[PDB]
Design a binder for this molecule. Structure first.
Ligand SMILES: *[C@@H]1O[C@H](CO)[C@@H](O[C@@H]2O[C@H](CO)[C@@H](O)[C@H](O)[C@H]2NC(C)=O)[C@H](O)[C@H]1NC(C)=O
Ligand SMILES: *[C@@H]1O[C@H](CO)[C@@H](O[C@@H]2O[C@H](CO)[C@@H](O)[C@H](O)[C@H]2NC(C)=O)[C@H](O)[C@H]1NC(C)=O
Lengths: 49, 49
């Protein structure tokens, strides 16, 4: 178990249905940032390096 | 986050302002060779190729 950050989607009854590892790849780092599972075409701002 | 999002929004609307003024042209047209149109000398306003 590693100290990483996940984003969790809860349903109408509080069941964790879906999750995103925020340190997996730059795509999943973006979904954690904007709070969405679906992200439109364009440039979005993410963390600095 | 608020800072980064604030400056990028201020910055992005500077590219919107520039296209709103200049980019009113649908097709790039060539520079004609004749510039003394009926005596009217247009060499100063046109670019020098
Ligand atoms: C949250 O739980 C409730 C149960 O209290 C679900 O409601 C039932 O849903 C099933 C199928 O989804 C239906 O066949 C039942 O008739 C429903 N019962 C009632 C009393 O409405 C509800 O669907 C759950 N939420 C989600 C998103 O699944
Ligand atoms: C229209 O104006 C241009 C200047 O923009 C004139 O071109 C100059 O002509 C003199 C005379 O030979 C040259 O010494 C200069 O070098 C020319 N300028 C450039 C930028 O090349 C042109 O002569 C004018 N048209 C007429 C009919 O007089």
């Amino acid at each position: 178990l590693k100290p990483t950050t996940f984003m969790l989607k809860y349903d109408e009854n509080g069941t964790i249905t879906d999750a995103v590892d925020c340190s997996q790849n730059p795509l999943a780092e973006l979904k954690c940032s904007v709070k969405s599972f679906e992200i439109d075409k364009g440039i979005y701002q993410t963390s600095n390096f | 986050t608020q800072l980064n999002r604030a400056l990028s929004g201020i910055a992005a609307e500077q590219d919107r302002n520039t296209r709103e003024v200049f980019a009113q042209v649908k097709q790039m047209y060539k520079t004609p060779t004749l510039k003394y149109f009926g005596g009217f000398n247009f060499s100063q306003i046109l670019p020098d190729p």
